[PDB]
């Protein structure tokens, strides 16, 4: 998520863009995911569970 402010665009709008670029890019989610070791069995467990919830 690289951003370049355009002319006569307020610092705020550019910022809001930037934060949404990272929301889009999944940075913090990604960093959260890797802060700590997850066992393979555990991430397979996570994967099934979300497949399941993704039925409405």
């Amino acid at each position: 998520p690289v951003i370049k402010v355009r002319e006569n665009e307020p610092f705020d709008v550019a910022l809001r863009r930037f934060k949404r670029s990272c929301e889009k890019a999944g940075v913090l989610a990604e960093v959260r995911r890797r802060e700590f070791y997850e066992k393979p069995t555990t991430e397979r467990k996570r994967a099934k569970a979300s497949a399941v919830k993704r039925h409405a």
């Binding site: 998520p1 690289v2 951003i3 370049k4 402010v5 610092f11 550019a14 910022l15 930037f18 934060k19 670029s21 990272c22 890019a25 940075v27 913090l28 990604e30 960093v31 959260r32 890797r34 802060e35 700590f36 070791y37 997850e38």
Partner: protein, 117 residues
Amino acid sequence: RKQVSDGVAHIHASFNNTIVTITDRQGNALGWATAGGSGFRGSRKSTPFAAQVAAERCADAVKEYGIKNLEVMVKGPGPGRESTIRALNAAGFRITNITDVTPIPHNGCRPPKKRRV
């Protein structure tokens, strides 16, 4: 003592703390301030407000060179990712570019165990 007018704000925002460093394009350190060393400890150290005064204190130990434009390099997930950037812009700074540079391994090193608190 010297002149730059064109810089880059590298902000390291970890969960426990947020270090702000101002630099030229070359990557040479012009000035720095941290939250933990601006009168904030533990529970207060890890706040956006502490990161803000860090950005403020840093803009005072750099305007000796009279920077006038800069880019921002946001690293890490903590507070002061964003609030630090704000303080810079209000301190009298034109923001050219914003970039997240938080490192992402392509799954390399095994991280520490989960904390069972």
